[PDB]
Every structure is written in structure tokens, then in C-alpha cells.
Amino acid sequence: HWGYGKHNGPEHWHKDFPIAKGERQSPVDIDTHTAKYDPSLKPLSVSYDQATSLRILNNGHAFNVEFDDSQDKAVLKGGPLDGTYRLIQFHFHWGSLDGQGSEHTVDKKKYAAELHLVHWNTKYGDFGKAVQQPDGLAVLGIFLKVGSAKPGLQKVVDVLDSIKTKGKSADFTNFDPRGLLPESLDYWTYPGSLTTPPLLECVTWIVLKEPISVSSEQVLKFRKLNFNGEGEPEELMVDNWRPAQPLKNRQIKASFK
Ligand SMILES: NS(=O)(=O)c1cc(C(=O)CSc2nc3cc(Br)ccc3[nH]2)ccc1Cl
Ligand SMILES: [Zn+2]
């Protein structure tokens, strides 16, 4: 029964998930002036040519586009990472209004939404084991601003009306996640956590500096989803973001400038 409301939202999560007040919680504000340029960071390697999407699911918090991660297909490596991480799913966080929705912020700026491409470290064999490790996951975070449409998003937007409510899913094959990436792979990176319960401190965050553009009509369609299940009172799925958490004893590193 965690969620995003007054009575079960982010300020409550610590009662069931006490690491909410831990030492490497996400998201955070990225202060671009105090991010350190790290000339030892490598270009990010994103190899999505063989990605195999399976399904899209409304899980009552967001929607997940899920991939077959049983072979070495869609992998993230390089950047700040030490080995190979396999794509398992992406999802977004977004707001009720274009002025909020991202979880990370950039000099306190909130974007309209934020995409998370979740990958697990192949040295741990699967996602469930990888989340128990401090280097288990790598999440590629991409900001969304409202402007032009993102054509490579439209296939996702079009299916949403089939998964309006919690627990619905739809076949979702042949979706190419390369169509959601901006031109540049310049990034910031820091050690953090899941931004949703159970808030495990297992993620290397890689947040792209360049946002993607989506249209107002595309994000409106995200806002028509529902947190409730079918046959329950309608609670629009909006504002499903955790606010920025204290940076504590961490440094955010930049791959550029
Ligand atoms: N928001 S996020 O930090 O990118 C993130 C979100 C998710 C979600 O699917 C959000 S809802 C959710 N995440 C879970 C993870 C575990 Br373990 C167990 C139950 C969960 N339910 C899974 C992984 C990551 Cl890394
Ligand atoms: Zn997320």
C-alpha cells in the first residue's frame, strides 16, 4: 500500500522501508556547477540493436515496458560501469502539469517527465539477485520536456489505452528503445537507489544531460492512465515521482565539459 498520495506517498515510505532515510537514496538534485568532470569516465555504450520487448504492464505506480533479458541482447556498458548490464524494463515518471514530473532535477529544474531504462549486472545472474548488491543495477535516466513529438514514443503512447488500470498488460513486441534516446550520450553519474520501494541501494545512476522532446499530446496520454484497478474509483496516474533526496556523502561526476 505505498503509493504517491498524501497518506501513502514519499513522506510515508520510511515506515515500511526504513532505508528511505539511508545514505545513498535517489533521486537527487544535480547541481551542475558542483558535478565534477571526470576525464577517466568512458563513453556510454548502449547496444540496443537486438532488444526484444515482450509486454507492457500497468503496475499501479507507472507502466513497465518489459524485455526478454534471458540472453545478451540489449546491454549497457562502459560509462562509469565495470561490467555488462542487461536491459530488463523501462518506465517513466511524470507530473500533473508540464512543470513537474521528473525525479532527478538539474539545478532545481524539474522536467515534465523522466524515463528510466533499468539494467542489471550480468555478474549476478538475474535482476532479483542483482538488487541485493551495491553495483547490481544501472539505470539510464533521460529527461522529457514538452515540445515536438517523439516519433519513437508513439507506439508506447498508442497502447496505453489498453492498459489503463492497475494489473493490465498488453503484448508489446518489436519496440525499439533506440527511438527514445537523445543525440548526445553526455551524462552525470552517482551511486544511488531505486526511487520506489523497496528503495534498495543498488543503482549506478547515469542521467543524460540532453532531454528528449515529447509533445503535449503524448504526455497527456500518460496522464490518462490510472493508479486504481478496473472497477475502482478513478485516480489519475500523475505525479508518480519521488522528490530529490539528500546527497549526503556523495559526488556527482560528469562525463563532459
Ligand atoms: N524508478 S527506478 O529506480 O528506475 C526502478 C523502478 C522499478 C519499478 O518497477 C518500480 S515499482 C517496483 N519496483 C520494485 C523493485 C523491487 Br526489487 C520489488 C518490487 C518493486 N516494485 C524497478 C527498478 C528500478 Cl531501478
Ligand atoms: Zn523509475
Side-chain angles (χ1 to χ4, degrees):
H1 98 171
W2 72 267
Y4 292 102
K6 178 76 180 178
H7 300 282
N8 62 358
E11 305 309 308
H12 294 276
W13 292 353
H14 70 103
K15 286 177 281 175
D16 269 343
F17 302 97
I19 205 69
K21 300 184 191 273
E23 298 307 299
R24 54 172 280 186
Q25 294 287 292
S26 286
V28 295
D29 178 55
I30 299 164
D31 170 341
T32 64
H33 289 295
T34 54
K36 178 76 183 171
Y37 169 67
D38 185 350
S40 72
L41 282 174
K42 305 177 142 224
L44 195 59
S45 164
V46 179
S47 302
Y48 290 168
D49 48 288
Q50 295 301 322
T52 296
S53 63
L54 289 183
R55 202 168 70 128
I56 189 176
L57 175 64
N58 180 337
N59 66 11
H61 308 294
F63 61 85
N64 295 343
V65 172
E66 289 157 357
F67 287 80
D68 173 12
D69 67 345
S70 66
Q71 294 174 78
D72 217 65
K73 277 155 159 181
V75 308
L76 182 67
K77 69 177 290 168
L81 308 171
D82 274 338
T84 293
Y85 290 65
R86 194 168 293 169
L87 177 68
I88 182 166
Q89 56 107 308
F90 69 80
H91 58 276
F92 299 82
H93 308 261
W94 61 88
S96 55
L97 304 148
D98 297 346
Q100 63 188 43
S102 65
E103 293 205 310
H104 294 87
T105 55
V106 180
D107 300 329
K108 303 298 179 86
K109 174 181 169 80
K110 297 172 166 146
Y111 290 79
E114 187 170 330
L115 163 64
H116 288 163
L117 294 133
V118 180
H119 309 71
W120 55 268
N121 194 327
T122 60
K123 74 192 265 211
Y124 301 120
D126 68 6
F127 172 88
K129 287 298 262 199
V131 298
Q132 298 177 58
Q133 313 298 336
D135 55 351
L137 295 192
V139 179
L140 175 68
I142 297 178
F143 297 117
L144 277 65
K145 66 190 200 148
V146 175
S148 68
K150 194 73 171 180
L153 185 64
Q154 189 62 30
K155 287 181 184 182
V156 169
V157 161
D158 280 337
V159 88
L160 303 172
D161 79 292
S162 69
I163 57 148
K164 180 181 205 198
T165 49
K166 179 181 179 217
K168 310 198 66 189
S169 65
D171 297 321
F172 199 66
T173 57
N174 291 297
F175 176 71
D176 192 335
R178 295 175 292 177
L180 295 176
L181 302 179
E183 285 170 12
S184 180
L185 297 179
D186 285 347
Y187 58 88
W188 292 287
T189 181
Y190 72 96
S193 70
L194 307 187
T195 67
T196 58
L199 300 172
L200 299 170
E201 290 180 337
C202 62
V203 181
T204 301
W205 277 94
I206 297 173
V207 177
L208 292 195
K209 171 199 49 39
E210 184 178 350
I212 56 168
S213 110
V214 299
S215 63
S216 57
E217 294 94 340
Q218 285 183 319
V219 68
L220 287 160
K221 288 190 201 168
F222 282 22
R223 304 180 180 131
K224 283 167 59 103
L225 290 168
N226 279 194
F227 287 126
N228 58 280
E230 188 188 1
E232 301 173 343
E234 181 173 34
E235 326 170 307
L236 290 182
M237 184 181 279
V238 293
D239 294 322
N240 52 0
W241 48 273
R242 189 186 192 192
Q245 297 304 306
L247 188 61
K248 296 184 167 185
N249 189 38
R250 296 175 284 179
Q251 193 61 40
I252 304 182
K253 293 282 201 75
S255 78
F256 60 90
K257 297 177 336 188

